[PDB]
Design a protein around this ligand. Structure first.
Ligand SMILES: CC1=C(O)/C(=C\N=N\C(=O)c2ccncc2)C(COP(=O)(O)O)=CN1
Ligand SMILES: CC1=C(O)/C(=C\N=N\C(=O)c2ccncc2)C(COP(=O)(O)O)=CN1
Lengths: 429, 428
């Protein structure tokens, strides 16, 4: 039992926040006291106010908070079995979820490794790729290649494939693996980009295990969109030069970009795939790494005899149960129409933002809207403005942006876009 | 899905920990329920009740489906499943942080929440790396530890795992090269600590931290060592200006007979990891704590921040069940409970010492180990335990248990009886 003022006091003294300091925070965190549907209840000047979760709590809350069907699946599982070890045991929530994932991901992804976060599923993906080649008698193939602008997590391997300015930084000179970086992938399709990619890959091929990318949308590294055709070229390059392809769909997964997985826009399958975030409907942390039967059987027949990974809470029944229900809920409705409407709503609402002085781009892709400005967005100016409009927004760098819950009404998208348009206008001043 | 369908979906599509696809020497057993210290498993088409002797890998200290913890979870679920921790704070996080700073070794004032043990370990290393960068000494970037340890499966965590291992020979070259002192022995030996100091001395300018599991090394070999070694480590680290990190992910929350295993020695590390028992085994959550000084040095550094922030950082649901699990631990006489467990483990396992294939028997708090003279065949051990109403998971040459704190004396006796019978079968 703590009051909002007591929460603030404990938090200031004792809580780290994402990429934050202790005792140097420019502004106090705001107290969140509830979340229901698309709305959060927050304390502002000692008063609870309801505001739209424009960001879906970082891509996670696809059906909104406290969706009756998701709450119900969680409590139904809670009464039967909270958790058992996954060593020598299996269970229904893991089986059901693995079943759904293999059916609905791009063709050929036949096996599923559960883990407890996105960064962990990325390191598992890398470990699959590395063990793969050792199982082929090619231990020299151990480096990773990616393109700039990417983000794959904060654990040390994951960091090595993050954008070097995204934070490498300079700050981590050594201690990171030195990976192969291609230039930023452009928005519009240019065959010259893919040709230069291939030439660069070609000369490293004998030391490359895999290419790892976010398909179609790069999220936390700067909300950039690229033509799906590039993914088709990667698949092609990777096949021809014998390098595995990893798609990191932790942010792009489960309908967000207008296809079920963004790889579907290109009609391509990677060899290894990561999912997370929206997987659980934003209730709990869970992730999965899927790989082809070939990858699975090469690992298993290699010297180690096994994938050498296994978190304590692997395949947690509670996480797997709420995920099963989150996935069925998406699939049981006309999700494609929902996303199309959302995209249209975002496009319409954000439109007037391009005629603003500080704004260099306005872009929409599925249920994702971005306003790019020509300077950093001042958080101590931006946050106040959006709160006043009943919206929780979180700009970073020069980007005002949103990934709203799938359940947002036209009135709610209008309200989100209007606060975004306003954040951009104040940037101009 | 029926159990048969679960088996079918599983063998086709599910990776298990440290497992193959399609080459599993044994099928997994379907688990369909868990209540208190008991699992309901399907064996030959029939549900059977078995004791969770391992506490689902150290996690289920209060057993499964404890009413206080179920209710803490459903209460949070009613109010707020999850919000982003960037720009926002909430009551579950504050309550759990308040609790953790109060009960951990003195001087651990700040709390970084993550989603798993391996992450919290990488967070600990990052903290140490950023600390020395903030002091203008970016050369202090290597880690040192002793052999026999385990800190997780992510790539940095792996670098401080015992090299034989999981499994540096097959890895290395992608693993950062850390400094390894010899295996810490069971009984106190001053010459061991003198040599540790001497080895650390010649790497001091490149070491960010010593990282160890205190008192009990879990997944690396279920080895115990004298807590005075931790006193030596704290002294060495202070004199040579290397941070000290205790990985208490397995040892935390009462399990070794003190609240935290660092307490057996009265030592405070600079950085500490907790996990597993933290949530009472309901959900994955972990935490990394460090001193105010480590926090301030990082925060005044070039970065001006600790450069980590998982999507689900400080998840309300996971924090809420954790708050309830810790409070349930503190609101009972846990110390007497663990002593009773230990006495019961020792009494029940005494008989294994005489067995032909047993090389050692050891207990430390609610942890019991029969060390055998050959690796244990799971195809023999598993049905043998199941025939006695117990879920045991041996590894390497070890038959061992870390039972839920709620186990009655008869249940502890049933567990140890099964362990003894597994050990008798190994010897043949
Ligand atoms: C002291 C210590 C640990 O014991 C662990 C993990 N322990 N893992 C198990 O006990 C285990 C054993 C066998 N199979 C799966 C997990 C970890 C890793 O935590 P995580 O496996 O990521 O949740 C870090 N520090
Ligand atoms: C594509 C992709 C990811 O987007 C992420 C994490 N995304 N993080 C956030 O969006 C985020 C944003 C702002 N602050 C903290 C995290 C990760 C890492 O996930 P994790 O943070 O370890 O659960 C891996 N792949």
């Amino acid at each position: 039992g703590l009051t909002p003022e007591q929460i603030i006091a404990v938090d200031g003294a004792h809580l780290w926040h994402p990429y934050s300091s202790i005792g140097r925070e420019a502004v106090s965190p705001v107290v969140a006291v509830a979340a229901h549907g698309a709305w959060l209840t927050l304390i502002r000047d000692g008063q609870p106010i309801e505001v739209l979760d424009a960001m879906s709590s970082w891509w996670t809350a696809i059906h909104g908070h406290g969706h009756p069907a998701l709450d119900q699946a969680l409590t139904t599982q809670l009464r039967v079995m909270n958790h058992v070890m996954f060593g020598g045991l299996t269970h229904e929530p893991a089986a059901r979820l693995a079943k759904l994932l293999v059916d609905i991901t791009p063709a050929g992804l036949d096996t599923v490794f559960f883990s407890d976060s996105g960064s962990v599923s990325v390191e598992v993906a890398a470990k699959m790729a590395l063990q793969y080649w050792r199982g082929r008698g090619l231990p020299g193939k151990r480096r990773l290649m990616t393109w700039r602008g990417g983000y794959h997590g904060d654990t040390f391997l994951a960091m090595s494939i993050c954008d070097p300015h995204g934070g490498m930084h300079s700050l981590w000179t050594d201690v990171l693996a030195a990976q192969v970086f291609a230039p930023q992938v452009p928005r519009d399709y240019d065959p010259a980009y893919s040709a230069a990619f291939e030439a660069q890959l070609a000369q490293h091929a004998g030391e490359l295990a895999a290419v790892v990318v976010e398909p179609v949308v790069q999220g936390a590294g700067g909300m950039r969109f690229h033509d799906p055709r590039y993914l088709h070229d990667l698949r092609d390059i990777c096949r021809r030069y014998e390098v595995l392809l990893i798609f990191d769909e932790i942010a792009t997964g489960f309908g967000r970009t207008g296809a079920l997985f963004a790889a579907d826009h290109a009609g391509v399958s990677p060899d290894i795939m990561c999912v997370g975030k929206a997987l659980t409907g934003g209730y709990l942390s869970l992730a999965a790494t899927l790989c082809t039967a070939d990858v699975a059987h090469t690992i298993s027949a290699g010297a180690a005899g096994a994938l050498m990974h296994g978190p304590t809470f692997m395949a947690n029944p509670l996480a797997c149960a709420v995920s099963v229900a989150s996935v069925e809920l998406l699939l049981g409705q006309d999700w494609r129409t929902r996303i199309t409407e959302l995209a249209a709503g975002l496009t319409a609402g954000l439109d007037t933002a391009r005629a603003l002085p500080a704004v260099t781009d306005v872009r929409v892709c599925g249920a994702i809207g971005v306003i790019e400005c020509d300077r950093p967005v001042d958080l101590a100016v931006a946050t106040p403005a959006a709160l006043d409009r009943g919206v929780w927004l979180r700009p970073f760098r020069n980007l005002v942006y949103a990934m709203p819950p799938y359940i947002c009404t036209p009135a709610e998208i209008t309200q989100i876009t209007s606060a975004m348009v306003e954040v951009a206008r104040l940037v101009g001043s």
